[PDB]
């Protein structure tokens, strides 16, 4: 399945490729700029602009990336590979959300074209200087969808579906709402985000074995926080927002009681 | 989960520490001292304030780790220096608290800690010998104020509860926002903050006398009977909680062959 | 130039020498006092009183003079009964004060300190034995309640602000008739008092210490940081310099041969 990270705010990933590779900033100040600028609001329980909603999944999907590569690193060419080509999306995609909360939206977007136009002109028939941008912490993923982290934990931890057949259920309801260009739910932003998470972790996974049993540690540690953040969603989009919410203190509290004073069928989602 | 007991007041254990820790009497002084004001209020059916609320789990905490220290007494003197130097001078704390609250009101001892924490602070050369004091102005049921009585939850079995363990998590995970939030918000809110802190007193004894487990036979009981009674009271309200304890009540008391096989089950 | 940290809050500096050295608890007991009473309110952003903008450069004051003196310690004990004598005892006076304002107000300090001038002029025979005294109504970062932060200031390079004699002539050609005034006139001057008297604590420990060039890479770069930040909120206003410090943020992380080679100067 086909989806865009940028493809719904009005860039493409083409687009993000017109500036060099080299001119983005390495990945340590870009963390410190929304650490330093809005992380009040990134903590907060609110998704009050969709780049939000899309910047509290890049910062935790390179948090989920990293501990993998320290993994593998004490077992190094493993963290020197993913700057190369997996952290390079990263960059691009902390960048291009903090000019856009920065700046606005569609100054930045007039901002990629400008400077792309600039680097690829001769050098003395173009201005003399860049056309510069400027004008003159922990996150729970789904805070801001009403539930938290120990939410989705008190279901157990064998419940929720494999990868393999949740994203079969996204591919087989929501293909044409998540490849539009248009949000139409914050958790549409959330999940185009999730999925690309875990395609950009399968491929550093299938990269360390095939290159030097890195599935196991992937599928119990890395795997289980995928399959609820696609469980969370999924049922969300399907079931509405605050029904799913009371299933987990349904189904939390079902699995508590004794077999023998609780009704003998689990209280399942449907409509 | 780390709640504390006196944040939804206005003190926290911190501010409580301006106080020495032999400045509170002894428990036996502080038990006449409710038992000679206060006996009357902590018995009526109704939670007339939340101090009221909290300062009877203050009183049947004490009432059951005086009855697992006398236990350990003789089934091995060292278990009751023990419990008087950091089990009964938290109770000690949450006895002076409350008590002091009650005659006096809240808002004078919130600031009798603090003018107290500028007398302990001086140096001895500069302050008066005078120690700032407040001057200004038994069996105890644990939910008899919320409507059901000790006796009334009795006819459940002892399996019908789920482990500490499944309760202790259940509400962590439920409203972890509310239990550690400074208000109130329910009188059942303030009984399971001390509810939570009392199961805290019988374990960190209980690892402690291991250096045997009937805890959870007897004493284990009656925190999972408060700690299903306060959650079910929130998750589903407390008349659909006190007119299903009934309706259990006339289903465990026939005999076998003359009851629906399945027990009742409380939701909605 | 010649300022004076309580004279914006109306007592003086000799009108506290009314009390004697040793009537003002440790620096270990006071800040246990504004930790457990004010620090949901001393790590705020917000500016809620006069008094916490003092305190929050008084723990800081203290925060970077303990580092200097623990620095002394390797690189030569004889530095501990200086750091107590001179500095501690000039921190643990304006500690005391703005404890003790934010707790009992700021005019029943006012009145106790002359209220323990008549306690302490009078002779020993006629003096009441007790001390008059009152008792009757962590991280701080030192630029979040104007809106900036450390790190956000952390992307301004190392030899972009001038040196501090250089910064504190800077102060006193633009704004003397406004600091030497017992007039608040803006959150920024009571932080700008601070900054300079912790100075001239900074400047005379490092004065005895050689009787030591790293004050300026490690605590000096830490003034220069705070007193460039309040003269350019003065002069170009507080909105303009924090819209500047972002536009620093996006030049200083592009990488050279991307970035124009003039850095975006401060206007208006």
């Known amino acids: 399945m086909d989806i865009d990270p940028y493809k719904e705010f009005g860039a493409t990933v083409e687009l993000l490729s017109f500036l060099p590779s080299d001119f983005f900033p390495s990945v340590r100040d870009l963390l410190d700029t929304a650490s330093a600028l809005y992380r009040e609001a990134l903590e907060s329980p609110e998704h009050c602009s969709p780049h939000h909603t899309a910047l509290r999944q890049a910062i935790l999907c390179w948090g989920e990336l990293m501990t993998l590569a320290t993994w593998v690193g004490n077992n190094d060419l493993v963290v020197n590979y993913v700057n190369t ?4 999306k990263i960059r691009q995609l902390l960048w291009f959300h903090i000019s856009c909360l920065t700046f606005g939206r569609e100054t930045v977007l007039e901002y990629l074209v400008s400077f792309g136009v600039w680097i690829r002109t001769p050098p ?22 009403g539930a938290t982290v120990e939410l989705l934990s008190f279901l157990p931890s064998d419940f929720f579906p494999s990868v393999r057949d949740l994203l079969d259920t996204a591919s ?13 739910s914050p958790h549409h932003t959330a999940l185009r ?10 491929t550093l996974a299938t990269w360390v074995g095939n290159n030097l049993l890195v599935v196991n540690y992937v599928n119990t540690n890395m795997g289980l926080k995928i399959r609820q953040l696609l469980w969370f969603h999924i049922s969300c989009l399907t079931f509405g927002r ?14 508590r009681t004794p ?9 399942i989602l449907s409509t």
């Open 259 to 267: 077999p023998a004073y609780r009704p003998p069928n689990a209280p």
């Open 172 to 184: 087989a309801l929501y293909r044409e709402a998540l490849e539009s260009p248009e949000h139409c």
């Open 85 to 88: 080509n997996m952290g390079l």
């Open 193 to 202: 985000q999730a999925i690309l998470c875990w395609g950009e972790l399968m």
């Open 124 to 145: 003395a028939y173009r201005p003399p200087n860049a056309p510069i941008l400027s004008t003159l912490m922990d996150i729970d993923p789904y805070k801001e969808f």
């Open 242 to 255: 605050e029904t799913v919410l009371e299933y987990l203190v349904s189904f939390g509290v079902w699995i």
